[PDB]
Design an enzyme around this catalytic site. Structure first.
Site, PDB file in Angstrom:
ATOM      1  N   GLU A 133       2.140  -1.337  -4.613  1.00  0.00           N
ATOM      2  CA  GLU A 133       0.772  -0.819  -4.677  1.00  0.00           C
ATOM      3  C   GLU A 133       0.012  -1.454  -5.831  1.00  0.00           C
ATOM      4  OE1 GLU A 133      -2.668   0.474  -4.371  1.00  0.00           O
ATOM      5  OE2 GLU A 133      -1.331   1.214  -2.824  1.00  0.00           O
TER       6      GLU A 133
ATOM      7  N   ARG B 201      -8.728   1.137   5.820  1.00  0.00           N
ATOM      8  CA  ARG B 201      -9.376   1.042   7.103  1.00  0.00           C
ATOM      9  C   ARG B 201     -10.782   0.568   6.865  1.00  0.00           C
ATOM     10  NH1 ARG B 201      -6.014   1.084  11.029  1.00  0.00           N
ATOM     11  NH2 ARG B 201      -7.737   1.805  12.355  1.00  0.00           N
TER      12      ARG B 201
ATOM     13  N   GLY C 187       0.833  -1.204   0.000  1.00  0.00           N
ATOM     14  CA  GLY C 187       0.000   0.000   0.000  1.00  0.00           C
ATOM     15  C   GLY C 187       0.866   1.252   0.000  1.00  0.00           C
TER      16      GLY C 187
ATOM     17  N   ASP D  19     -14.961   7.558  11.866  1.00  0.00           N
ATOM     18  CA  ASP D  19     -14.568   6.498  10.920  1.00  0.00           C
ATOM     19  C   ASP D  19     -15.670   5.461  10.638  1.00  0.00           C
ATOM     20  OD1 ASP D  19     -11.952   7.612  10.604  1.00  0.00           O
ATOM     21  OD2 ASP D  19     -10.934   5.749  11.220  1.00  0.00           O
TER      22      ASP D  19
ATOM     23  N   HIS E 108       7.410  38.635   5.664  1.00  0.00           N
ATOM     24  CA  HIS E 108       8.604  38.294   4.918  1.00  0.00           C
ATOM     25  C   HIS E 108       9.775  38.190   5.880  1.00  0.00           C
ATOM     26  CE1 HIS E 108      11.256  38.089   1.441  1.00  0.00           C
ATOM     27  NE2 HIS E 108      12.079  38.868   2.119  1.00  0.00           N
TER      28      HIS E 108
HETATM   29  C1  LIG Z   1      19.546  42.215  10.811  1.00  0.00           C
HETATM   30  C2  LIG Z   1      18.202  42.594  10.250  1.00  0.00           C
HETATM   31  C3  LIG Z   1      17.200  41.638  10.172  1.00  0.00           C
HETATM   32  C4  LIG Z   1      15.946  41.959   9.648  1.00  0.00           C
HETATM   33  N1  LIG Z   1      14.986  40.997   9.596  1.00  0.00           N
HETATM   34  C5  LIG Z   1      13.762  41.267   9.095  1.00  0.00           C
HETATM   35  C6  LIG Z   1      12.700  40.235   9.011  1.00  0.00           C
HETATM   36  O1  LIG Z   1      12.924  39.076   9.416  1.00  0.00           O
HETATM   37  N2  LIG Z   1      11.502  40.583   8.520  1.00  0.00           N
HETATM   38  C7  LIG Z   1      11.249  41.838   8.077  1.00  0.00           C
HETATM   39  O2  LIG Z   1      10.121  42.118   7.612  1.00  0.00           O
HETATM   40  N3  LIG Z   1      12.180  42.828   8.107  1.00  0.00           N
HETATM   41  C8  LIG Z   1      13.417  42.615   8.594  1.00  0.00           C
HETATM   42  N4  LIG Z   1      14.382  43.640   8.630  1.00  0.00           N
HETATM   43  C9  LIG Z   1      13.994  44.956   8.120  1.00  0.00           C
HETATM   44  C10 LIG Z   1      14.128  44.999   6.600  1.00  0.00           C
HETATM   45  O3  LIG Z   1      15.492  44.690   6.210  1.00  0.00           O
HETATM   46  C11 LIG Z   1      13.730  46.384   6.093  1.00  0.00           C
HETATM   47  O4  LIG Z   1      12.473  46.791   6.670  1.00  0.00           O
HETATM   48  C12 LIG Z   1      13.657  46.437   4.570  1.00  0.00           C
HETATM   49  O5  LIG Z   1      14.916  46.071   3.990  1.00  0.00           O
HETATM   50  C13 LIG Z   1      13.318  47.835   4.079  1.00  0.00           C
HETATM   51  O6  LIG Z   1      13.263  47.792   2.665  1.00  0.00           O
HETATM   52  P1  LIG Z   1      13.458  49.116   1.795  1.00  0.00           P
HETATM   53  O7  LIG Z   1      13.336  48.692   0.349  1.00  0.00           O
HETATM   54  O8  LIG Z   1      12.577  50.203   2.334  1.00  0.00           O
HETATM   55  O9  LIG Z   1      14.967  49.604   2.153  1.00  0.00           O
HETATM   56  P2  LIG Z   1      16.406  48.861   2.033  1.00  0.00           P
HETATM   57  O10 LIG Z   1      16.247  47.366   2.084  1.00  0.00           O
HETATM   58  O11 LIG Z   1      17.330  49.558   3.004  1.00  0.00           O
HETATM   59  O12 LIG Z   1      16.908  49.161   0.545  1.00  0.00           O
HETATM   60  C14 LIG Z   1      17.328  50.458   0.155  1.00  0.00           C
HETATM   61  C15 LIG Z   1      18.200  50.281  -1.062  1.00  0.00           C
HETATM   62  O13 LIG Z   1      18.400  51.538  -1.704  1.00  0.00           O
HETATM   63  C16 LIG Z   1      19.808  51.721  -1.914  1.00  0.00           C
HETATM   64  N5  LIG Z   1      19.989  53.170  -2.012  1.00  0.00           N
HETATM   65  C17 LIG Z   1      19.843  54.096  -1.053  1.00  0.00           C
HETATM   66  N6  LIG Z   1      20.013  55.338  -1.565  1.00  0.00           N
HETATM   67  C18 LIG Z   1      20.245  55.201  -2.876  1.00  0.00           C
HETATM   68  C19 LIG Z   1      20.503  56.105  -4.005  1.00  0.00           C
HETATM   69  N7  LIG Z   1      20.553  57.442  -3.816  1.00  0.00           N
HETATM   70  N8  LIG Z   1      20.704  55.541  -5.225  1.00  0.00           N
HETATM   71  C20 LIG Z   1      20.654  54.205  -5.425  1.00  0.00           C
HETATM   72  N9  LIG Z   1      20.427  53.324  -4.432  1.00  0.00           N
HETATM   73  C21 LIG Z   1      20.216  53.769  -3.168  1.00  0.00           C
HETATM   74  C22 LIG Z   1      20.482  50.977  -0.800  1.00  0.00           C
HETATM   75  O14 LIG Z   1      21.826  50.666  -1.178  1.00  0.00           O
HETATM   76  C23 LIG Z   1      19.578  49.759  -0.706  1.00  0.00           C
HETATM   77  O15 LIG Z   1      19.930  48.750  -1.663  1.00  0.00           O
HETATM   78  C24 LIG Z   1      15.673  43.342   9.152  1.00  0.00           C
HETATM   79  C25 LIG Z   1      16.696  44.292   9.224  1.00  0.00           C
HETATM   80  C26 LIG Z   1      17.936  43.972   9.756  1.00  0.00           C
HETATM   81  C27 LIG Z   1      19.007  45.042   9.806  1.00  0.00           C
HETATM   82  C1  LIG Z   2      -1.195   4.919  11.180  1.00  0.00           C
HETATM   83  C2  LIG Z   2      -2.305   5.933  11.120  1.00  0.00           C
HETATM   84  C3  LIG Z   2      -1.996   7.288  11.019  1.00  0.00           C
HETATM   85  C4  LIG Z   2      -3.006   8.243  10.964  1.00  0.00           C
HETATM   86  N1  LIG Z   2      -2.675   9.560  10.868  1.00  0.00           N
HETATM   87  C5  LIG Z   2      -3.641  10.508  10.812  1.00  0.00           C
HETATM   88  C6  LIG Z   2      -3.338  11.957  10.717  1.00  0.00           C
HETATM   89  O1  LIG Z   2      -2.152  12.345  10.683  1.00  0.00           O
HETATM   90  N2  LIG Z   2      -4.355  12.831  10.666  1.00  0.00           N
HETATM   91  C7  LIG Z   2      -5.647  12.438  10.708  1.00  0.00           C
HETATM   92  O2  LIG Z   2      -6.566  13.283  10.655  1.00  0.00           O
HETATM   93  N3  LIG Z   2      -6.000  11.139  10.799  1.00  0.00           N
HETATM   94  C8  LIG Z   2      -5.071  10.152  10.855  1.00  0.00           C
HETATM   95  N4  LIG Z   2      -5.450   8.806  10.961  1.00  0.00           N
HETATM   96  C9  LIG Z   2      -6.885   8.503  10.990  1.00  0.00           C
HETATM   97  C10 LIG Z   2      -7.453   8.653  12.389  1.00  0.00           C
HETATM   98  O3  LIG Z   2      -6.752   7.795  13.305  1.00  0.00           O
HETATM   99  C11 LIG Z   2      -8.936   8.302  12.376  1.00  0.00           C
HETATM  100  O4  LIG Z   2      -9.609   9.006  11.315  1.00  0.00           O
HETATM  101  C12 LIG Z   2      -9.593   8.668  13.695  1.00  0.00           C
HETATM  102  O5  LIG Z   2      -8.939   8.012  14.797  1.00  0.00           O
HETATM  103  C13 LIG Z   2     -11.058   8.267  13.703  1.00  0.00           C
HETATM  104  O6  LIG Z   2     -11.566   8.586  14.986  1.00  0.00           O
HETATM  105  P1  LIG Z   2     -12.873   7.861  15.567  1.00  0.00           P
HETATM  106  O7  LIG Z   2     -13.127   8.441  16.933  1.00  0.00           O
HETATM  107  O8  LIG Z   2     -13.963   7.873  14.532  1.00  0.00           O
HETATM  108  O9  LIG Z   2     -12.479   6.308  15.703  1.00  0.00           O
HETATM  109  P2  LIG Z   2     -11.253   5.609  16.472  1.00  0.00           P
HETATM  110  O10 LIG Z   2     -10.094   6.555  16.642  1.00  0.00           O
HETATM  111  O11 LIG Z   2     -11.050   4.290  15.788  1.00  0.00           O
HETATM  112  O12 LIG Z   2     -11.842   5.332  17.942  1.00  0.00           O
HETATM  113  C14 LIG Z   2     -12.798   4.294  18.167  1.00  0.00           C
HETATM  114  C15 LIG Z   2     -12.746   3.924  19.639  1.00  0.00           C
HETATM  115  O13 LIG Z   2     -13.915   3.206  20.038  1.00  0.00           O
HETATM  116  C16 LIG Z   2     -13.529   2.021  20.757  1.00  0.00           C
HETATM  117  N5  LIG Z   2     -14.653   1.085  20.579  1.00  0.00           N
HETATM  118  C17 LIG Z   2     -15.056   0.506  19.436  1.00  0.00           C
HETATM  119  N6  LIG Z   2     -16.183  -0.225  19.646  1.00  0.00           N
HETATM  120  C18 LIG Z   2     -16.511  -0.080  20.942  1.00  0.00           C
HETATM  121  C19 LIG Z   2     -17.571  -0.578  21.834  1.00  0.00           C
HETATM  122  N7  LIG Z   2     -18.537  -1.387  21.365  1.00  0.00           N
HETATM  123  N8  LIG Z   2     -17.534  -0.193  23.133  1.00  0.00           N
HETATM  124  C20 LIG Z   2     -16.587   0.623  23.622  1.00  0.00           C
HETATM  125  N9  LIG Z   2     -15.584   1.099  22.862  1.00  0.00           N
HETATM  126  C21 LIG Z   2     -15.510   0.794  21.546  1.00  0.00           C
HETATM  127  C22 LIG Z   2     -12.187   1.647  20.190  1.00  0.00           C
HETATM  128  O14 LIG Z   2     -11.460   0.890  21.147  1.00  0.00           O
HETATM  129  C23 LIG Z   2     -11.578   3.010  19.949  1.00  0.00           C
HETATM  130  O15 LIG Z   2     -10.937   3.460  21.144  1.00  0.00           O
HETATM  131  C24 LIG Z   2      -4.441   7.813  11.024  1.00  0.00           C
HETATM  132  C25 LIG Z   2      -4.738   6.454  11.130  1.00  0.00           C
HETATM  133  C26 LIG Z   2      -3.732   5.503  11.184  1.00  0.00           C
HETATM  134  C27 LIG Z   2      -4.114   4.049  11.295  1.00  0.00           C
END
Ligand SMILES: Cc1cc2nc3c(=O)[nH]c(=O)nc-3n(C[C@H](O)[C@H](O)[C@H](O)COP(=O)(O)OP(=O)(O)OC[C@H]3O[C@@H](n4cnc5c(N)ncnc54)[C@H](O)[C@@H]3O)c2cc1C
Ligand SMILES: Cc1cc2nc3c(=O)[nH]c(=O)nc-3n(C[C@H](O)[C@H](O)[C@H](O)COP(=O)(O)OP(=O)(O)OC[C@H]3O[C@@H](n4cnc5c(N)ncnc54)[C@H](O)[C@@H]3O)c2cc1C
Ligand SMILES: [Ca+2]
Lengths: 473, 473
Positions: free
Chosen positions: A211, A280, A188, A320, A452
């Site tokens: 499969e 299942r 499967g 299920d 970003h």
């Molecule tokens: C360490 C660090 C981490 C950061 N991490 C994030 C983040 O994770 N997420 C996020 O959203 N923001 C982050 N920022 C902020 C982000 O970098 C700025 O908000 C963003 O770059 C601003 O874009 P901008 O185009 O306004 O200016 P800038 O990116 O400063 O670009 C200005 C450009 O114009 C050029 N330039 C300037 N004057 C002239 C000219 N007269 N002639 C020609 N070219 C010129 C410069 O050389 C430069 O290339 C981070 C900043 C730092 C310092």
């Molecule tokens: C390997 C694997 C990976 C999976 N991964 C995902 C995932 O990543 N995301 C996702 O959304 N789904 C996943 N599933 C599916 C998910 O497990 C099922 O869709 C979900 O558990 C269904 O829930 P349920 O409550 O309907 O039934 P079940 O989870 O089967 O629960 C039924 C319960 O009722 C009990 N029971 C049954 N009959 C009786 C009775 N007469 N009296 C008392 N108790 C009873 C059983 O013992 C059991 O505890 C996966 C399944 C498998 C097998």
């Protein structure tokens, strides 16, 4: 004792239905038979014990092992050696599962949901409503006005090859192998098979996935499936689709899977362990359904209408065990909706916006329709795509594989589907589900500010691509 | 030559404004002076060269180094003899910066933007619009109908302590240190200071961060600020706020920072390198604003109205050089809006929905208003939060630090702010921005199906908490 609601099952559907019903002021009983290794309570059903939770835990630990072995030198991280302590890796997962079991018990206590550890079955109708008998680990005779059947699913078996969880493994055994197998076979290539095969390959096994269906991940977008198949081949997962499997033989030493490959050539896959992941099936064993006339369809699902109501008065069914996506979040949606309906509210369940996620590397996530499906319905559309190679965050992250894709109605621009393959796809898809719930347009995504640098910017750019105006590609 | 639009600067604001203007069918020139190591073109401004991109690159590599040393044992991964090849780590970042420089050059070519590598300056007003002179690495005389000033920012300096990028480092020097300093001092506990301090601490430095402002991360939600301080303290960042910094002296490979702590006691911090991260100041060096009477404010920002229009007809200014959040996505939002306005459209820039992100571990991301701001304006609200400790994905991941918080209007339920501290918060916030752009409610977030198990579920649960009905807590 008497209750307003008796919920049979404590998996995602039942435990949430119980909690929601308690919030709405009802006296609730939740009966669940699952047991931990020592025979004690283990709520959370399939998802917590042998499903979503443990599979995601092993995927993470195995991904770290893959990173340590092949992707740390490029970051300037030098190591003298790397070795695996499988007991500790499996042990962490076991601890997480237990944490979840205990957590649900705590939630039941907090919400005053009465938990019964045992098997629940219909006995019949009585004056107060429905008579439910609990047996096994606990004996009880309960009465409830409303019953919510949330009995879940079981692993589909290959005919004539029962699971033993030692050599022939279902999802249960796949998560508990005691030693990394030299050669692992997986039957499967669906979501579960790919996830399980990936785990063990990363830990050192040679893995072959066979499969029977000719098309790989047919439900995924065509572009996604193709890219995924390419990545999986690079990773070393030998995936073969369109095969015809013969009589599998499990001997003490080797498990031999004879098969005819897609080309028509005879093959024999010889492995140390075999995981069978072919679907299942709904579970109603011991529910005593037939005795009270609770209707099941031909596939064993409890039959329900659009509101999860069965043929019996005040008997509902969710998760299920009923039609629809067999997913945890789908079960939870139905559980909440049924509790709300019992309480006299409307409830809301919409399968059209249910997201699908594959937790492989790369991650895959989607919501809505694929291009294939839209073409099948004759729905005119425009699709836009943007690769992670062009995303600043993916570049900084050191993981540029994949893309984001947005599909919109060609006339109205309404988003009809979003498909993502790449880093953190599982989390990025939330934005798309939200857009679809508001019936938003591609242009709406394109005009929303995205921080970003973030991977989420790929969804914005994909939306800009719908209108042929990507800024960064 | 004659152009409809001449953009001065190729950082996020300018390169995006240029591309968008070209998409809209206008003839566009983009002038930028930044130089790479060999004196050639290096588009992307501060963000690409010494900002967002390289900072996020070092954060990821240093996080991998930290994981290898302390978080792999618990996953059953025994890695012995971990060491750092700093030149390789810095080199990976340099390659990513070069990929981004080259990528923007390609985007200009693809979009028919004429790029001039040089310094652009106003010469005067002419009949065809504005005479813009390019000097330095390129000589040219251009005429533009519209001019977009996107000259960005430079690093704020302490009086009497100029940067040398050897001992006294700005963001520039912070991303290029040749050896891990045994003791690193950082002046400024804001976003950049926390990020740079974290990078070098993970790589082996003993870090001390000194901040003049008495409140830590005053702009963030106070509960987020409090948890962050706790996490950073645990990690080893010695953050001291409310200190009075004296006259810093660098001599003989060492730097002494005299200061008076928050309790009035003199102290002396002696470190091997010092990073000063106390803000960014608007840059217009060589623009020749005086030749045309372009109005600047008392801090050096180009004065603009609500639509980014300056006092000169058809001269606009965007990004760090004008008022508002000094962020890359803010600059891009304004560049796009100005190009759209030049083309005759309305344009859209809303600072209320601009997200703020801190790429530390844990990550911090927020959008909208804090509880403290809402109290001040007397707007009644309802807040709800959910901890990652109760989230299944965080548990599976093995990183349960933090929480998600949703703030809604008490009467209309409209979401007014979302604050997240925890894993992947930078990506999870996209959902919140989207909700705010649709003027969505907490109940909308709560009803939207979130895939299980995902960190995004914490946002849904926080929304449920607003209505006092969390399910999993
Ligand atoms: C360490 C660090 C981490 C950061 N991490 C994030 C983040 O994770 N997420 C996020 O959203 N923001 C982050 N920022 C902020 C982000 O970098 C700025 O908000 C963003 O770059 C601003 O874009 P901008 O185009 O306004 O200016 P800038 O990116 O400063 O670009 C200005 C450009 O114009 C050029 N330039 C300037 N004057 C002239 C000219 N007269 N002639 C020609 N070219 C010129 C410069 O050389 C430069 O290339 C981070 C900043 C730092 C310092
Ligand atoms: C390997 C694997 C990976 C999976 N991964 C995902 C995932 O990543 N995301 C996702 O959304 N789904 C996943 N599933 C599916 C998910 O497990 C099922 O869709 C979900 O558990 C269904 O829930 P349920 O409550 O309907 O039934 P079940 O989870 O089967 O629960 C039924 C319960 O009722 C009990 N029971 C049954 N009959 C009786 C009775 N007469 N009296 C008392 N108790 C009873 C059983 O013992 C059991 O505890 C996966 C399944 C498998 C097998
Ligand atoms: Ca504050």
């Amino acid at each position: 004792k008497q209750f307003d609601v008796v919920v049979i099952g404590a998996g995602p559907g039942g435990y949430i239905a119980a909690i929601r019903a308690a919030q709405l002021g009802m006296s609730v009983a939740c009966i669940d038979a699952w047991q931990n290794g020592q025979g004690g309570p283990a709520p959370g059903g399939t998802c917590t014990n042998v499903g979503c939770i443990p599979s995601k835990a092993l995927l993470q630990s195995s991904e770290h092992y893959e990173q340590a072995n092949h992707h740390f030198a490029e970051h300037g991280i030098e190591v003298k050696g790397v070795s695996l302590k499988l007991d500790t890796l499996i042990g962490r997962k076991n601890t997480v599962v237990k944490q979840n079991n205990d957590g649900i018990l705590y939630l039941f206590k907090k919400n005053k949901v009465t938990y019964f550890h045992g098997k629940g079955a219909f006995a019949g109708q009585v004056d107060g409503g429905w008579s439910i008998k609990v047996t096994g680990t606990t004996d009880a005779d309960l009465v409830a006005k409303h019953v919510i059947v949330a009995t879940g699913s079981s692993a589909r078996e290959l005919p004539g090859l029962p699971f033993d969880e030692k050599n022939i493994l279902s999802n249960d055994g796949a998560l508990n192998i005691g030693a990394v197998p030299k050669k692992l076979g997986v039957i499967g290539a669906g979501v579960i098979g790919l996830e399980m095969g990936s785990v063990w390959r990363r830990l050192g096994a040679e893995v072959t996935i066979l499969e029977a269906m000719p098309e790989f991940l047919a439900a995924a977008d065509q572009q996604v499936a193709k890219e995924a198949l390419k990545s999986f081949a690079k990773q070393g997962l030998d995936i073969q689709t369109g095969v015809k499997i013969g009589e599998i033989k499990a001997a003490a030493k080797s498990i031999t899977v004879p098969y005819v490959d897609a080309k028509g050539a005879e093959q024999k896959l010889v492995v140390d362990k075999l995981i069978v992941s072919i679907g299942r099936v709904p579970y109603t064993g011991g529910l005593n359904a037939e005795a009270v006339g609770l209707k099941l369809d031909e596939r064993g699902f409890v039959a329900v209408d659009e509101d999860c109501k069965t043929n019996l008065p005040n008997v509902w069914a969710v998760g299920d065990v009923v039609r629809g996506p067999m997913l945890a979040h789908k079960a939870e949606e139905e559980g909440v909706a049924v509790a709300e309906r019992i309480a006299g509210q409307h409830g809301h369940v919409n399968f059209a916006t249910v997201p699908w996620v594959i937790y492989t590397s790369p991650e895959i996530a989607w919501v809505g329709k694929t291009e294939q499906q839209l073409k099948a319905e004759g729905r005119e559309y425009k699709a836009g795509s943007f690769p992670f190679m062009a995303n600043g965050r993916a570049r900084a992250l050191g993981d540029t594989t994949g893309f984001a894709k947005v599909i919109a109605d060609a006339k109205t621009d309404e988003v009809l589907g979003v498909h993502i393959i790449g880093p953190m796809a599982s989390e990025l898809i939330s934005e798309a589900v939200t857009i679809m719930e508001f019936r938003g347009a591609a242009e709406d995504i394109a005009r929303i500010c995205h921080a970003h640098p973030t991977l989420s910017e790929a969804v914005k750019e994909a939306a800009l691509a719908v209108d042929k105006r990507t800024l960064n590609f």
